[PDB]
Structure formats: structure tokens, C-alpha cells
Homo-oligomer: 472 residues x 3
Amino acid sequence: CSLSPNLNIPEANYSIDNKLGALSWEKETNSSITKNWWKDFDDENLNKVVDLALKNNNDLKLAFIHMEQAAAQLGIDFSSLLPKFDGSASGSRAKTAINAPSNRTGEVSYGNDFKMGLNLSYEIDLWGKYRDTYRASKSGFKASEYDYEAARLSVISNTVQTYFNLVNAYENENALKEAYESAKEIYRINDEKFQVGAVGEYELAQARANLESMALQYNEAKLNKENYLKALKILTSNDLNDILYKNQSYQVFNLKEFDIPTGISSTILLQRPDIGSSLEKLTQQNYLVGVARTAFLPSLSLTGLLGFESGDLDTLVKGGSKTWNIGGNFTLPIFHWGEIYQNVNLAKLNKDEAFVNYQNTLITAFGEIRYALVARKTIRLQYDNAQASEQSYKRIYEIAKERYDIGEMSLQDYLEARQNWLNAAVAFNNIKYSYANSIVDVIKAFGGGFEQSEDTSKNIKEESKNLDMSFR
Amino acid sequence: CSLSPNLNIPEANYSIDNKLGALSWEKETNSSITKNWWKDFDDENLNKVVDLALKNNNDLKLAFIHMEQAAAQLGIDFSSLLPKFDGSASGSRAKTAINAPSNRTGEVSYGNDFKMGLNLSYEIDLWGKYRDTYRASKSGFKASEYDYEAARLSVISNTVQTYFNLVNAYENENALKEAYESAKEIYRINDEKFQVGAVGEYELAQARANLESMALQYNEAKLNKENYLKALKILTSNDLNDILYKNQSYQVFNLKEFDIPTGISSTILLQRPDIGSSLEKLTQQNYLVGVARTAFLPSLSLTGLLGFESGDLDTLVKGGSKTWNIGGNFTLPIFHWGEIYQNVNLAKLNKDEAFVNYQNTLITAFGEIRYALVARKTIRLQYDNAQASEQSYKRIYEIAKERYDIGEMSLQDYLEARQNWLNAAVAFNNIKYSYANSIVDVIKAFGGGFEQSEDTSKNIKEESKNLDMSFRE
Amino acid sequence: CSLSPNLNIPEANYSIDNKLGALSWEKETNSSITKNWWKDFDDENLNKVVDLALKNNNDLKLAFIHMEQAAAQLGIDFSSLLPKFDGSASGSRAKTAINAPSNRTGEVSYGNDFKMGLNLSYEIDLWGKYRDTYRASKSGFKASEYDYEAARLSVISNTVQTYFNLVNAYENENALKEAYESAKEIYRINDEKFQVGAVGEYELAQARANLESMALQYNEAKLNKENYLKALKILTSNDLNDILYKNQSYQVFNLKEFDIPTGISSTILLQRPDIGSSLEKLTQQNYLVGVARTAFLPSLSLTGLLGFESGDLDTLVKGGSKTWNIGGNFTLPIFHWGEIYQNVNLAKLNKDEAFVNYQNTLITAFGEIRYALVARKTIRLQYDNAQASEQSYKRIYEIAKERYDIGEMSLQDYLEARQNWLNAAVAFNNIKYSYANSIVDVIKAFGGGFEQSEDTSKNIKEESKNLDMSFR
Ligand SMILES: CCCCCCCCOCCOCCOCCOCCO
Ligand SMILES: CCCCCCCCOCCOCCOCCOCCO
Ligand SMILES: CCCCCCCCOCCOCCOCCOCCO
Ligand SMILES: CCCCCCCCOCCOCCOCCOCCO
Ligand SMILES: CCCCCCCCOCCOCCOCCOCCO
Ligand SMILES: CCCCCCCCOCCOCCOCCOCCO
Ligand SMILES: CCCCCCCCOCCOCCOCCOCCO
Ligand SMILES: CCCCCCCCOCCOCCOCCOCCO
Ligand SMILES: CCCCCCCCOCCOCCOCCOCCO
Ligand SMILES: CCCCCCCCOCCOCCOCCOCCO
Ligand SMILES: CCCCCCCCOCCOCCOCCOCCO
Ligand SMILES: CCCCCCCCOCCOCCOCCOCCO
Ligand SMILES: CCCCCCCCOCCOCCOCCOCCO
Ligand SMILES: CCCCCCCCOCCOCCOCCOCCO
Ligand SMILES: CCCCCCCCOCCOCCOCCOCCO
Ligand SMILES: CCCCCCCCOCCOCCOCCOCCO
Ligand SMILES: CCCCCCCCOCCOCCOCCOCCO
Ligand SMILES: CCCCCCCCOCCOCCOCCOCCO
């Protein structure tokens, strides 16, 4: 039987509300997430970049290895349920003393002892010490599977979000490229006018200050682009030359409708990998409580031998050397003065720690779901605000250029109008790809399509087809 | 009875100075910290959210469990100081070969052996191998207690500072709400004037750009508010609906004076939990050095049996089957070619590592104290600066509005003056609660009222009264 | 013999390109790095603070101890290759039952048994179980040496970059100090003029607003200074009073050319300590594969005794009590139902994990090298942009001050011109010391002068002469 205590996970009680992540003019959605959710961005550059991650990402490989390690440990603990067989052979020579109690000859005794045979050893699993040890590893392996799914979701999400940050950086670098192009022209015009006394030193300094400031901002954008370029290569590449010299082809993100949840699911506990992993790690420690409690109970051991024994090597495999034995041992602790009690206590405390870990995983998840839903619909508003702001500042700049060209506006006010448009355009870019990443955060928080009910082992094998483990 | 070396912790030598964190017009204070320092903010909402943390925080629960685990290991190692008693029963059958040296009959020998009785097993702790193993665990438990105190202070401080960051987020959001409302009114006016030809396309675009900019800044403030709301929920709540849908009632921080240190304490080593924890972990490793050195010395093992033995089961508990034995065994390593010597070295290096960890904890603590004190008084100055700045920019706005309404100021200049007030108002909010959190940092750096000399176990039990451990009850 | 598999590390294939980190008007360089590279900043204040770090930094001490611990473990595993010798002595008194099989006297038997002598125990390392255990620990020690070199490079680089961040903070605090002094006088003038009706409330408010704003920015700069002051103290100091009360003498960074790589080295694998560490940790796990595989093969044990035995303590060391024995024992597992096989799998997977760790180290390293090179040459361009920008905004301020003093410019146009100069000066400060730290990033990413071919143990001993281990 088994001494494992009944595992009582309290029900997660919460209300559903699909208006939580939906704007008033938006459709309330609780639809499920597709497994390959990233293809809904209609970006083939992104698709190829994700496939590179699912192939080359080392963190994902480590998670796969951790899973295999857990399976290997599972196999080891299963063997403990079966009787072990070993072969042995020995030879020895001894001078037995005259005063030795086993010596009745009154003389010095020289003798040999040669042995050879098969050995049987088996601990009778009466109280489920070895079954629950095995079942603990089984729970551990399932936890490693869920941890792998969590790692896959994390790697894919990080890859998508780094990609969009990179595109964000390309757009800002390009918007700052032209802003510097015109800054060169504007200065060159005022430089020509200064040589003929058409502008003063003050205005020329303003034109020059604008030129250098734009150049400084331009190079900052290049730097910011390089950072996310590096971050994407590290997540996806295995080619050292690609990492060193190559760049990344990309596609501008344009606003569209996304089939993502707008409220928390009724089966969220079965849809997040980390929750499932945390669950399995709890029952793992629960089985280990049973293992610890068997120490209070009697242990039964079976030993057997079949082979040969002789005082002479020449007669070792003779008929007169044939020997065997079989034995059962029954040991039972009486007073260990708290040793076993505190060990069971320690096992119970490890379960408590696993339970608290589970609760914290639950709290954090629900915290992530709340923010992700609110952030998505809030940034959605920002998309309209930043778009309209950029258009307004662009129109202001257009009128400013007209007035400046016919001397009806100072250079200072004209330069300010340019900067304001630049800021608005950059801000709109930042909002645009913050919204793209906000879609990912929602998908990430809801599990990315993971379902605990499905065949976890079969799903993992199918989705890990292209994982590069050629190294072994 | 012990091979543990003398533990020689060098003294921490430093000068005291109560002007380090005190302004020239401020009183230099070296008063101690009350256990529940957070109630001096006079915020009932803050008090409630701290109690929720002390009740529901899972990191606090983990720290409590880690302490209980250390107590359990302490109980395990205590048992090794006492003789163990076990019961045993066995039965075996054997075909002893003719050629077996033990066989004198010249014939195949079948025989049985049945045993049953009580067993004694006791390791004589001549050199304190098990005494120091116990003492190491005792120091490990004491370290877990100090780690719990450190975790408690950390959880409380984080909860308080998250609360204030949340209130800061509410204030900026509300300020940006009004800034958005009037900006919408500004555009509505300029939109009406446009259709009757009272304003140009240029001015209408400026009013619209201002409207969208404010709306963008507004939603950012909401987003920043939601971020700290989530942070507070995770720290204090065990209700999933509360986490998902509820908000947080709060109270604006008003500038008062707090009874906090302005200079480093003369007993700072006894007032920080992390220093005490780091200390106990050092003595723990020191005891383990002694344990490792006992391997060089002779070990003595005592065994005893009282029970029965017979070649037949039917006479197993008969009188002629009664038997007993008592045994002692000395073992002494002679040549192990560095095995034991390097194990002692390894144990001594573990102690060195714990010493370096202690030094680093000391250095970090003093660094935190310096910054916390200087930051507190510097941000105190910033409070007056940001308040006066906000008032000046507000008066500027009030005049700029009067002038714009009678057409004596361009819309652009008017929108700018208004944006400047908003910036100054937000900046003052940020300074206000950065000062509130600066108070906490000082309190945190000085241990939050912890005193090592007190009964830690009694204190821990008293202060963990409301800790929710009902999941195992 | 050994059962360790042949380790096959794939070649790191990549192209060289000295233009990667070189501007068009710079000389492309592939020159190696001097081991004390920080002295090329010509800063004596920086030199003393690095020496303090190399003496007092606790992370550096921990890495030194970790190396010593690995050395101790190596000594332990060396001993397992040699026969052990132990002394023993025992005494037992037993009432042997009448029914006991060994008792053929028909009556209760009381008897003693006393033993004393030297014991031999030796595991014949036929399959390299203990030799590869030893060789694994040796690789572990060499890995710890490289980890120390990596820690040394890390501590030094952090100390230098923290120093430059501190000087950046001091320079900005000084710039905001003088800006505060000017703002205090500007307000004082307007305050005087106000009470004689020479300026209005609107202008006075602008003067006060500018004054309080500068005061807020000034005190913020102090805070930023104190933060990097603390960070430097923790990295370098062991004196509590110094940490609490003292400040840091410094030296302004002046632009100069530095002899650093502009392209990736052809021997970068031998120049980065962290790569060498990952390599050694891989061979370590490789040797352990062999160790695990020895469990399949027969273990041979040698046992010996030389001493005494008697049923009487009075005759224990007499001639008739002299006894000895010698023996060999073979053990060979037959059926273990996966236990050993899965243990080998587990060991194989630990090697795979170490391989993935190595690969990830390579990818990260090449990513760091790419960014460090591009950042260096880009911030180099920014240096000229920020310098020219600051000088332009300074000239604008000078002309603006002239016009304001004769009433030909409004107060807030003059205050704006002041703030713009301050911003440009602070920005140029940030760029200046971001460039200094960009130099360090390049040196750091290239190993900081480390060469794997050199006598690692000799180098470590020589470069750690000032490491304060006086506590022991
Ligand atoms: C690596 C080598 C290990 C040691 C080998 C020692 C050499 C073996 O010597 C053999 C001696 O043989 C005699 C044994 O017994 C002799 C007396 O009694 C025999 C009974 O008739
Ligand atoms: C019919 C009566 C039952 C017993 C008769 C058994 C016949 C003989 O079986 C002997 C089998 O012995 C096994 C010997 O094992 C070899 C050990 O090798 C281990 C090597 O290191
Ligand atoms: C790994 C191999 C272990 C093999 C163990 C075999 C033990 C056999 O036990 C048999 C004893 O049970 C009762 C039978 O004894 C025979 C008595 O009569 C013999 C005929 O004269
Ligand atoms: C690894 C080595 C395994 C050796 C296995 C040996 C198996 C053979 O067993 C047969 C024994 O019987 C043979 C006959 O012997 C007759 C002896 O009679 C006289 C008394 O000793
Ligand atoms: C893994 C295989 C285990 C084999 C078990 C063998 C059990 C032996 O049975 C013994 C029964 O009784 C012993 C007498 O047998 C006949 C007497 O003479 C023949 C001896 O080989
Ligand atoms: C799963 C249970 C274990 C396997 C089956 C047990 C086999 C039963 O064997 C019983 C026969 O042996 C009886 C004892 O024989 C002793 C011979 O000597 C007689 C004189 O005392
Ligand atoms: C001169 C000395 C007096 C002799 C007194 C004899 C008392 C015998 O005590 C032996 C009891 O044996 C203990 C049984 O072991 C139990 C093992 O399994 C657990 C079952 O409950
Ligand atoms: C857990 C139970 C352990 C029981 C240990 C039993 C030890 C008792 O024996 C020790 C006494 O020493 C010898 C005394 O005998 C005296 C001689 O008696 C002979 C009478 O003719
Ligand atoms: C946990 C209980 C352990 C009990 C230990 C006591 C063992 C008794 O030892 C007695 C030693 O010698 C005295 C008795 O001698 C033998 C008894 O019969 C004598 C003649 O009638
Ligand atoms: C799978 C469970 C098998 C249980 C077997 C237990 C092993 C113990 O065997 C011991 C030997 O059996 C002895 C049989 O004969 C007993 C006779 O007792 C009185 C005669 O001297
Ligand atoms: C948990 C099991 C404990 C069993 C305790 C048994 C105690 C009873 O002891 C009885 C002793 O007296 C029996 C009388 O025997 C006299 C004849 O002996 C002759 C030799 O065989
Ligand atoms: C706490 C330690 C208590 C002492 C334990 C010592 C180990 C027990 O040894 C048992 C045997 O004692 C033998 C006593 O008599 C010895 C006489 O020797 C022969 C004289 O002719
Ligand atoms: C707490 C310390 C251990 C307890 C010691 C108990 C007292 C030991 O007494 C020892 C003296 O007795 C010597 C042996 O006596 C019996 C021998 O009988 C046969 C003599 O030839
Ligand atoms: C041909 C053989 C020559 C005879 C040589 C006899 C040498 C005997 O050596 C025995 C030495 O015994 C040492 C045992 O030490 C006891 C363990 O504990 C010691 C603590 O002080
Ligand atoms: C820790 C020390 C272990 C010492 C082991 C000693 C082993 C002795 O080996 C010698 C055995 O080899 C054969 C010797 O026998 C010769 C017979 O001579 C008898 C004289 O009449
Ligand atoms: C630690 C090294 C110890 C070495 C022990 C060597 C063992 C001695 O060799 C055994 C030789 O066997 C022959 C017996 O010797 C005769 C007995 O004493 C002399 C009487 O004639
Ligand atoms: C730490 C304790 C070590 C003890 C070592 C003891 C070694 C002494 O050996 C002495 C051997 O000489 C024996 C002399 O007497 C011989 C008597 O022979 C007569 C028959 O018994
Ligand atoms: C480092 C290698 C050491 C090798 C030792 C192996 C284990 C020792 O085994 C001893 C076996 O003794 C038997 C040999 O002597 C037999 C003599 O008989 C001869 C006449 O029948």
C-alpha cells in the first residue's frame, strides 16, 4: 500500500468578466488561443525568426535536456521496484591464530576460501516506500514537461517581442535619418546666407546646434537598433558570422484585429504551463511525505545466493562445492529520539513549501492576466492618440515651413515645429510596437494555447521536431 | 570533546556622527525605531495593507517554513547524541557445501538460523563529531530566524513603498485627468471659432495636437497606475477576485517629521537581521570545521543485542535460545594519502567563504546606511524646491490664462505655460512620495526595530500571530 | 583503462574583419590587450581604486576560495587512486544460546573476542572509475581558475566603469551647481527690480520658477553622485569610516586614441576566460560519463589484515594471537532493470547540458563583441556631435545674455537659452564618459588580456599577491 497523505488542492474561486480587456466599441472575446499564434501578425520575417528560435535557442534545449534528465531519474527509481541480481567471485587466504575462538586445534591454522555465485537482493515494498519514490519522480517528470512548455512559450514570446522592438528601432532610426538629412540642408542654407550677410551669427548657431543635436539623436537611434539586433541574434542564431555581421529583414507592423481573450478563462488553471508544473511539483512532495513515513514501519528484506564454495580452487566447481541460501530480515525502529519524527516533519514542511510556491504561482498569474488585459485596451487607445498627435504636429510643421520660407516665421519657431513632429512620429512608433507586444503579453499570460488535458508527451515530440540536438 | 577552532570575529570600528543625515536646521536624532514604524504615517489604509501582507505574503510564508525546516534538521542532529534502539527478526536456510571450510562433517549440510531481539547502536562522541554537528544546526536555525526577520522587514518595506508608489500613480493620473479635460475644452472652443472663421487652421491644429498629447499622457498615467496596483495585489492579497477586479483605497501623504536616525547607530551590528544571520552562518561553518577534523581521531562504536537465536523456529523463544552480546569497536585512519587532510581544508575554506560573506554583508549594510541618510535629507530639500516650483509655475499659468482670454497671448505660449504647470505638479508628486519612501529606506537600513539581544523565538511567535498557515490546518 | 568517450568540440568557424569597429578615418587594429589596460587612461586616481578592488573586493575573494575548494576536492579524488590503511581494535562478550547453531556444547556458552591490527582496503581501478573521477575534478579545478580570471576581469571592469560613472556624476553636479548660482542671482536682480516696480509679477514668477527648478535639478545631481559614490565604496573599500564619510578624488576624462581591437580576434576562443571555463566544464562532464559506465563492469576489491585475535585479553598481543589475511573480491551486476543504464543516460545528459552551456557562452560572447565594437565607434561619432552642440548652445547663450542685458530679449527667452546650454553640457558629459566605458566594454569582451596558452596557475598566483586574505 501507500502512506502518502491525501492531496487537497483548494478550488480556485473567481468570477469571469469579458469586459475587463474590451473597450466599449470592442467585441467581448473568450475564444481560445491558436498554437501558432505568432503567424496572426501576417509577417513572414517574424515567422522565419521564430522558427530559428525553436531550432537554435539554447535555453529551449536546456529545458529539453532537463526533461530527459527527469525521465532518466524516473527509470532509475522504477528499477527499485524489482529484485536485483549480481554475480560475485572471491578468494582469500588467512593465518588463523591459535588464540582465535574459532580455532580448536591448539595450533596455527592456514586456510583458503573460494566463493562464486549469483546473488539476490530485494526490499519488499510493503508500505510503498519505493512505489511513492517512483511516483514522486513521475510527478517530477511531468513537471519538467510543463516546465519545457513554459520555456517554449517564454522563448517564442521573447523572440517576437525582441523582433518588434528591433523594428521599432529601425523605424526610429529611419525617422531620425531624414530629420538629420534636412538638418544638414537647413544649416547649409543658413551657412550660405551667412557668407553674404543674409543671416546673423545667432541664427547660424541655432541652425548648427540643430544639426549637431539631430546627429547626436541619430547615432543614439543607431545604437538602440544595434542593441535589439544583438538581442535577436542571441535568441535565434547558431551561425557565428550571422551573429557578427548580418542584419535582420523586417516588416512594418500595421494595426489589425486580433482574436485574443478579453477576459479571464474559466479553465485558466489548465491553460498555463507554469501552474501545471507547480501542481505536479506539489504532488511530488506529497508522495515524498509518504516515503518519509515508511521509516516508522518495519522493513522486509530478501537475500539469496546460488553458487559454489571450497577451501581449494581445483574443486570450486565440483558437486561437493555447490551451495545456496535464502533469508528474510525484519527490522523495526524502537527509539530514535525524534530522528524519524523530525524527518517526517521535514518532509511535511517540504510539501508546505511546494504548496506556498503553488499559491504564489497562482497569485502572480492572475496579476499578469489583469495587467495584460488592461494594458492591451489602454495602449489601443494610445494608438489613436499618438496617431492623431503625429498628424497634427505634421500639419503644424507644414504650415510652419510655408511661413518660414517667406520670412514670416523665425528659424527658432520653425526648428521647434520640426522637433515636435519628430517627437510625435517617434512616440507613435513606440506606441505602435508597444501595442504589438501588448498582444503577446495577453497571449503569454493565457498560456499561448497550452492545454493541460491534452497528451503532453505527444505534443512535445511533435513541436520539438526541428529542435537542433545534432550536437549530440 | 570538540575540535572546533576559536571563532575570532574582528571588531567593526567606525565613528558615529548624527549630522550625516540631518539638515542644518534639523535636530540630530539617534532615537531607536519602533517595531511598527509604518503607523507613524498616520494612514489607516496603509496599516490595513501591511496587515494583509503580514497575513498573506507567500515569501513571508516561505521564510517561516525555512525556519521550521531548520528546526526539524536541528531535531534530527540532536538525536545523534543518543543511543538508538531497534528491533530485529530474521530467518535463513542454507545448503553448506562439503568443500566449505566451515563444514567438518564431510557431507552436505542443510541448516537453519532464526534470530529475534532488541539492538543497541551508539556512537561514542569522544571528539564532538556529533556535538558540533548539532551546534552547527543550532547556528543554522538561529540564522533561519534572523533570515525570517530580514524577510519580514523586506516584505513590509516593499509593501509600504509599493503603496506610496501607487498613491503617487493615482495623483499623477488624477492631475493628468484634469489636464485632459480642460485640454478638450480648449479644443472645443477653438473648433467652434474655426467654423465661424475666428481662428486659423494653424491654431486649431495646435489645440488638437495638445488634446491628443494630453490624452496620450493620460493613458500612460493609467497604465503606470495599473502596474503598481498589480504589484500591491501580488504582495498582499489571497483573493483572486480582489486581484482581478478590485482597486485600492488610499490617503495622500502629508509632510510631517519622523523620529528616525540621522547618524549610524553604535549597535548597528545588533540591529540588522542580515548581519546576525550572516554571523550565525559563519559560526555554523566554524563548527563544521571541528566535525571534519574528528575524522583524524579514533571513533568508538557501541553495539548491544538482547534476544533469541535457534536452529529451529519452534524453540526460538525457549529458555535455551536466550542470548545477548555487547561490543565496542575502535577505528583509526593511518594513511589515506591526503583524503582526510583535504576534507579539513575544504571545511576550512567553507568557513572562509562564510567569513567573506559576512564582510560583504557588513560593507553593503554601511553603504546602504550612508545613501539612505544622505538621500533622506537631500530629498527633504527637494520637497521645498518642487513645492515652490509648482506654485510659481501655477501663478505663471494663472496670469497666462487671463492674458490669453483677452487675446494678449498666443495659444502656443498659453499651452506651454499650462504644460509647464502640469510638469511641475507631477514632479512635486514624484518628489513627495520619493521622500516617503526615503523614510522607509532609512528605517530599513537600520533594521526596522530589530534587536538581536532580545528573545528572537518569542518575538517571532508573537509577531507571526496572523500569518495565514491555514492551508495545512 | 578508461571508459570516457572521445570529446569532439566542433570548430568555431568565423571570418575576420578589422573594419567592424573602425571608423573610416581610424586605423584598423588587431593588436592584443595589455594585462593592465586601465593604466592607459593616464588616471592615477583610477589606478589606486583598481588596486583597492584587487585587494578588498569580496567577490574576487570568493572566486579565489572557489578555486581553492576545487583544489581541495582534487586532492580528495587523487587519494582514491591509492590503497588505504586503517587501524582497528574491538572487544565483544556474548552469551551464546544453547539452541544457537554454532553452539554444539549443549549448554550456555559465555565467550569473548578481542581484535587489533592494521587493515588494507583498495579498489583496483581497472576501468578508470577513480581515474576519470580524478580527471573530472582536475578539469573542474582548471574551470575554477578560468572562473577566477573571469571574476577578476569583471571586478576590474565594474570598478573602472563605476569610477567613470562617478566622475560623470561629479561633472554634472558641478555644472548644475553653477547653473543654480546664476539662477539665484537672476532671481535676486528681478526681486530687487520688482519692489521698485521695474519688473512685473509674471517675470518675477518666471525667475523664481527657474530658480526652484534649478535647485531641484541640482539636488538630483547630488543624489546621482552619492549613488555612484556608494557603488564605488562597496566595490573597493574595507574601511567602514571610509565607506561612511569619505569621498573620491578623481580626474576628468580627456579624449585620446586607444590601442584596442577594431575587429574580432582569430584566437578569441583562447582569449576569453568564460569560454575556457565552459570548455573545461564540458570535459569534466565527459570524464564523468566514463565513470558512470564503469558500473557495468566488474569491480575488484583488495582487503588485507595484519594483527591479533584472542578470546582472552591477557594474551591479545602474544605470539599465539598473531593473525593475517588477504583477499580479492569481484562483483558484477547482472540484472538491474535499467538502474545502471539510466544512470549512464543521466551522465550523458549532464554532458549535453554542459555542451549547450558552452554553445550559449560562444553565442553570447560573439554578440557582446559585435555590440562593443559598433558602440565604441558610434559613441566616438557622438563625442564630436555632443561637443559641437554644446559649443553652439553656449554661443547662443552668450549672444542671448548680451541682448537680455540691454532689454532686447524677454526673460524667458533668456532663461530658455540658459537651460539649453545646461542640457547640452550635461549631455556632452554623459557622452564623454559613456565613451570611456565603451572602451572598457571592448577590452572586457576581448578577455582583457587573458591568454589560455599561458601558465594559468603561475599568472593567477602573481596577480593575486595583493589580495587581502588576512582574516585567515
Ligand atoms: C602485483 C602482484 C601482487 C603480488 C603477487 C605476489 C606473488 C605471488 O606469490 C605466490 C606464492 O605462492 C605460494 C602460496 O602458498 C604457499 C604455501 O602454502 C601452499 C599450500 O600447499
Ligand atoms: C537441483 C537442485 C538445485 C541446485 C543445483 C544447482 C545446479 C548448479 O547451479 C550452480 C549455478 O551456479 C551459479 C554460479 O554463478 C557464477 C558466478 O559468476 C559471477 C562472476 O563474477
Ligand atoms: C540468486 C539465486 C538465489 C537462489 C536461492 C535459492 C534458495 C532455495 O531454497 C530452498 C529451501 O527451501 C526448502 C527446501 O529445502 C530442501 C530440503 O530437502 C532437500 C532434500 O534432501
Ligand atoms: C564463471 C564460471 C562459472 C562456472 C560454472 C560451472 C557449472 C558446472 O557445474 C557442474 C558441476 O557438477 C559436475 C560434477 O562434479 C562432480 C563432483 O563430485 C565430487 C564432489 O565434489
Ligand atoms: C535464479 C535461480 C534460482 C534457483 C534455485 C534453486 C533451488 C534449489 O533447490 C534445492 C532443493 O533441495 C535441495 C536438494 O536437492 C537435491 C539434492 O542433491 C542435489 C544437489 O544439487
Ligand atoms: C511467494 C512465496 C514464496 C515462494 C514459494 C515458497 C515455496 C514453498 O516451499 C515449501 C517447502 O519446503 C518445506 C521445508 O522443507 C524443509 C526440509 O527439511 C525437513 C526437515 O526439517
Ligand atoms: C538475563 C537477561 C534477561 C533476558 C530477557 C529476555 C527478553 C527478550 O527480549 C527480546 C525481544 O525481542 C524483540 C522482538 O523484535 C521485534 C521485531 O519486529 C517487530 C515486531 O513487532
Ligand atoms: C539493547 C540491549 C542490549 C543488551 C546488552 C547486554 C549486555 C550484558 O552483558 C554484560 C555483562 O558482562 C558480563 C557478565 O557476566 C558475568 C558472568 O556470568 C557467568 C555465570 O556463571
Ligand atoms: C533495554 C534492556 C537491556 C537489558 C540488559 C540486561 C542484560 C542482562 O545481563 C546479565 C548479565 O549476567 C547476569 C545473568 O547471568 C545469566 C543468567 O542466569 C544465571 C544463572 O541462573
Ligand atoms: C516473496 C516472499 C517470500 C518469503 C520468504 C521469506 C524468507 C525466509 O526464509 C527463511 C528460511 O525458511 C526456513 C524454512 O524452514 C523452517 C523450519 O524451522 C524449523 C526447523 O529447523
Ligand atoms: C515480540 C516478541 C517477544 C517475545 C518474548 C518472549 C518471552 C517469553 O519467554 C519465555 C521464557 O521461558 C520459556 C521456558 O523455556 C524453558 C525450556 O527451555 C529449554 C530449551 O529449549
Ligand atoms: C561508554 C563506554 C562503555 C564501555 C564499552 C566497552 C566495550 C564493550 O566490550 C565488551 C567486552 O568486555 C569484556 C570484558 O572482559 C574482558 C576480559 O578479558 C579476558 C580476561 O581473561
Ligand atoms: C556507563 C559505563 C559503562 C557501564 C559499566 C558497567 C560495569 C562493568 O563491569 C565490568 C567488570 O566485570 C568484568 C567481567 O565480569 C564477568 C566475567 O566473567 C568471567 C570471568 O572470567
Ligand atoms: C609475519 C607477521 C609478523 C607479525 C607482525 C605483527 C604486527 C601487528 O600489528 C598490529 C598493530 O595494531 C595496531 C592497532 O591500532 C589500534 C587502533 O586504534 C589506535 C588508537 O590509539
Ligand atoms: C594492512 C596489511 C595487510 C597484510 C596482509 C598480509 C598477507 C599475507 O600474505 C601471505 C600469504 O601468502 C602465502 C604465505 O603462506 C606460506 C605458508 O607457510 C607456512 C609455514 O609453515
Ligand atoms: C604491512 C605489511 C605487512 C607484511 C606482512 C607479511 C606477511 C607474512 O608472510 C606470510 C608467510 O607465511 C609463512 C608463515 O610464517 C611462519 C610463522 O612464523 C614463523 C614460525 O616458524
Ligand atoms: C597502539 C598499540 C599497538 C600495539 C602493538 C603491539 C605489538 C607487539 O607485538 C608483540 C609480539 O611479540 C610476542 C612475544 O611473545 C610471544 C609469546 O608466544 C607464546 C604463545 O602465545
Ligand atoms: C595488486 C594485486 C594483488 C593480488 C591479490 C589477489 C587476492 C589474494 O588472494 C589470495 C588467494 O590465496 C590463494 C592462493 O594460495 C593457494 C595455495 O595452494 C597451493 C596448493 O594447493
